[PDB]
């Protein structure tokens, strides 16, 4: 948009009364954005912000998080299908549910969080693209060029060390969102699990969560109720059949991608929290819907 559009919508946003989280449903795993505005999707991430008490914690002033968040949303690469600014802001928002509805937020510090709500919301920066097709390597770099930018600063109130840490966070975050590292370092969060070792308060243990968690609210997409996730689907076939320039295997591939990927890391995230159960309850019930498709219906 131009120099006046964007300017605009700064103006409506940073003037905007938020409404409470109640109110705008981002407390719910089931959460949609389909009919929300651009707009409404920076309004739900000022309440994530706010009822997280990073605002008030890190002495955010508002028209700086404003034009933060319109930042990162005007930055991401156009003509992404999947990828974009909306899967960035559910990605978010099942990070705000989990920490809120799923009661991970006591178990994590508020810098960790800071960092994760961030990298949540910039993971998908300078999509490049590329099975192996879904096997894509992040890029931290705009996010912190972004954050680091006149007028974007939202951690300047945070003292040099707070800074290098959470900057520090957000890098292993976004990294984590690569399936390739999920895929390589989550056997040892399984069987710490399994054999009831787990333990938040081993400094190795709780970085290897939080790529855990970074997975778990990127993958998301897979739990939400089945007219959503199908819909959703329809955005990820899309965009790798724009990446080719078929679908009757959609159906048999979706199953496979819940079973090698997702499943298993629902049930453990499930083990960390018993309230973060709805996520695996939405996998399983989409992949008895795909697998009814696949066996043909
Ligand atoms: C964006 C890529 C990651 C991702 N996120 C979501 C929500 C999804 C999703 O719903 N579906 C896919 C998704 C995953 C695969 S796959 O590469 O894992 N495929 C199945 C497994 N077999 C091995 C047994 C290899 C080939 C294939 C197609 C996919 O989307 C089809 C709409 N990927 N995906």
Same mark, same amino acid.
């Given at each position: $948009?131009?120099?006046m559009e964007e300017t605009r919508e700064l103006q409506s946003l940073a003037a905007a009364v938020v409404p409470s989280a109640q109110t705008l449903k981002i407390t719910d795993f089931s959460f949609s954005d389909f009919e929300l505005s651009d707009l409404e999707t920076a309004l739900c991430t000022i309440r994530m912000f706010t009822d997280l008490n990073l605002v008030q914690n890190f002495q955010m002033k508002h028209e700086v998080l404003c034009r933060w968040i319109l930042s990162v949303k005007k930055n991401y690469r156009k003509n992404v299908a999947y990828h974009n600014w909306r899967h960035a802001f559910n990605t978010a928002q099942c990070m705000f549910a989990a920490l809120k509805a799923g009661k991970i937020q006591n178990k994590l510090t508020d810098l960790e969080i800071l960092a994760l709500l961030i990298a949540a919301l910039s993971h998908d920066?300078?999509?490049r693209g590329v099975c192996h097709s879904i096997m894509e390597h992040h890029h931290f770099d705009q996010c912190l060029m972004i954050l680091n930018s006149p007028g974007n600063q939202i951690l300047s109130g945070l003292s040099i060390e707070e800074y290098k840490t959470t900057l520090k966070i957000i890098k292993q975050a976004?990294? *984590?969102t690569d399936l390739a590292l999920y895929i390589?370092?989550?056997g040892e969060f399984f069987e710490l699990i399994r054999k009831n070792q787990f333990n938040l308060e081993d400094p190795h243990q709780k970085e290897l969560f939080? *790529?855990?968690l970074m997975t778990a609210c990127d993958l998301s997409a897979i739990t939400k109720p089945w007219p959503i996730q199908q819909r959703i689907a !329809?955005?990820?076939a899309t965009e790798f059949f724009d990446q080719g320039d078929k679908k009757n295997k959609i159906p048999s591939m979706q199953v496979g991608f819940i079973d090698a990927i997702c499943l298993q890391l629902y049930e453990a995230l499930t083990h960390v929290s018993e309230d973060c159960f709805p996520?695996?309850? $939405?996998?399983?019930?989409?992949?008895?819907?795909?697998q009814a498709?696949? !066996?043909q219906q």
């Open positions: $948009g131009s120099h920066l300078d999509h976004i990294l *984590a390589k370092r989550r939080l *790529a855990m !329809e955005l990820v996520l695996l309850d $939405g996998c399983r019930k989409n992949r008895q819907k795909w498709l696949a !066996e």
